[PDB]
Nucleic acid binder design. Structure first.
Ligand SMILES: [Mg+2]
Length: 528
DNA sequence: GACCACGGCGCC
DNA sequence: GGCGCCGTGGTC
């Protein structure tokens, strides 16, 4: 309540306001600090930002990123958001956290500062006795905050000219497809409108409408529905190609070039730390965790991500991290042997259940896929699909046992846990409507494996980052079970070696963790 | 110019 | 299973 002049005492909680949500692009409108119960408001923010030793408060990372932008080394420290997020992943927003635990998220810097000091005490207390959740805060989450700050502030270098050339070329190909579609349509119309396209296909042309949209109940025109109509008419062939190009052009090719920062000449994403229910990171503004890789055009877009002059990119990907984690949690002897002997999984899992059929189940068992789905995709009847599943479990029994065990606990305790003890509360496991319940169950037993893979990758980044500094290298991107680094080409070899070891042995399980590494000048070449 | 819901799709 | 962003359509 008391107002002392700037600056504040040591260890004060920071509050701040931005002109916009992206710290790399925002203008610092005001900052303040709180300690004990009194507030310190800065006359001139950018100047005053140098008096601080660490950014400590709600959204600590954001301010830290902006400080880095200004050439200031202001590391992020404590953040009540991370405490609330560990107590319950559904706590994803300051406004929400405040409205739940107390206080009010306003747009006045001083008010935000006081809010941080109070909410921190509150939540830090609520974390009394919860040692495993406390271990995650000290040893993983809080330290990762500072790593992510350097990733966002470093950005990635982009080949802008390359994407300009590619935009025109792709624009050229879209023109040919739009044309031949209008020809078979008998008239022109908006192809980007699924409402217009529904009419031409299912009414004008005499095509069968197989499925409906969720909320409104219209005849769907999704790629699945379309693929099924591939034989009925040559028009859908071209529409499927049209969608492919438009998607890749509207989302990646056109926008990314226009998001280069002038001060850096690089592209800057945001890594959100309290955004998912399983403990995963998410990415936005822009999302660099969903850059295309599959199709030919998609691969060309990924070549536009390049290293600095005199530097190389280093790409490290875990192999079947989620399946290897399931082996550890399930304790299933057989599945462990497959990994322990270091053999190709999707062939050994076939041999020990009697190729294609082997993969789809391993992929889908984590998601608890429908017996009808395996029948639909693998192009096999319902009974053969339904039998294969029972056959998979007869081979890996402790897996099925682990699923049933997991759900029983979730019904009793109200939550499920990862190996390190990250909680997700899943309510409707005792729902009396089967579809609601069985949906909640799928959410339930998946969380520990996705969440445990997320814990290991997070922990590796924490351990790796100090080592990269000793060698003058950088952490650039993260894609759930992948990392992209940047080293000087003189030392990139050694960095790839060390990074691999750090990731693999981050937390020895019942099986080994394997990492595939590659070095290239662009994101694409650094894998092939 | 802002925001919103929906269908649709990119990635792990 | 877990995300975020696109254009369309509609509203203020
Ligand atoms: Mg949606």
């Amino acid at each position: 309540l008391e107002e002392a002049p700037w600056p504040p005492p040591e260890g004060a909680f920071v509050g701040f306001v931005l002109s916009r949500k992206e710290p790399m692009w925002a203008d610092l409108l005001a900052l303040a600090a709180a300690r004990g119960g009194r507030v310190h408001r800065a006359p001139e923010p950018y100047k005053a930002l140098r008096d601080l030793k660490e950014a400590r408060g709600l959204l600590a990372k954001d301010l830290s990123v902006l400080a880095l932008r200004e050439g200031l080394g202001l590391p992020p420290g404590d953040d009540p958001m991370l405490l609330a997020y560990l107590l319950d992943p559904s706590n994803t927003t300051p406004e929400g956290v405040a409205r739940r635990y107390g206080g009010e998220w306003t747009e006045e810097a001083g008010e935000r500062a006081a809010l941080s000091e109070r909410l921190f005490a509150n939540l830090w207390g609520r974390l009394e006795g919860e040692e495993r959740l406390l271990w995650l805060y000290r040893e993983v989450e809080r330290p990762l905050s500072a790593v992510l700050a350097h990733m966002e502030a470093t950005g990635v270098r982009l080949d802008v000219a390359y994407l300009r050339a590619l935009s025109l070329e792709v624009a050229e190909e879209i023109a040919r497809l739009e044309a031949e579609v209008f020809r078979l349509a008998g008239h022109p119309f908006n192809l980007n409108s699924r409402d217009q396209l529904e009419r031409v296909l299912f009414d004008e042309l005499g095509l069968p409408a197989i499925g409906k949209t969720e909320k409104t109940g219209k005849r769907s025109t999704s790629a699945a529905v379309l693929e099924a109509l591939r034989e009925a008419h040559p028009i859908v062939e071209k529409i499927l190609q049209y969608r492919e190009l438009t998607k890749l052009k509207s989302t990646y090719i056109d926008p990314l070039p226009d998001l280069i920062h002038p001060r850096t000449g690089r592209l800057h994403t945001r890594f959100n730390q309290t955004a998912t229910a399983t403990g995963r990171l998410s990415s936005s503004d822009p999302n660099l965790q969903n850059i295309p890789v599959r199709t030919p055009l998609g691969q060309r877009i990924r070549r536009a991500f390049i290293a600095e002059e005199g530097w190389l990119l280093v790409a490290l990907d875990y192999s079947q991290i989620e399946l290897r984690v399931l082996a550890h949690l399930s304790g299933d002897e057989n599945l462990i042997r497959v990994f322990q002997e270091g053999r190709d999984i999707h062939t050994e899992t076939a041999s020990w259940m009697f190729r294609r059929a082997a993969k789809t189940i391993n992929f889908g068992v984590l998601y608890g896929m429908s017996a009808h789905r395996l029948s639909q995709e693998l192009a096999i009847p319902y009974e053969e699909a339904q039998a294969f599943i029972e056959r998979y479990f007869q081979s890996f029994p402790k897996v099925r046992a682990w699923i049933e065990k997991t759900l029983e606990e979730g019904r009793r305790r109200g939550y499920v846990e990862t190996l390190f003890g990250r909680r997700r509360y899943v309510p409707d496991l005792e729902a009396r409507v089967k579809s609601v319940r069985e949906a909640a169950e799928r959410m339930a037993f998946n969380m520990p494996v996705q969440g445990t893979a997320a814990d290991l990758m997070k922990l590796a980044m924490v351990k790796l980052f100090p080592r990269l500094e000793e060698m003058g290298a950088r952490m650039l991107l993260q894609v759930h079970d992948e990392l992209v680094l940047e080293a000087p080409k003189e030392r990139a070899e050694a960095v790839a070696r060390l990074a691999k070891e750090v990731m693999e042995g981050v937390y020895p399980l019942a099986v080994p963790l394997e990492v595939e590494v590659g070095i290239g000048e662009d994101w694409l070449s650094a894998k092939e």
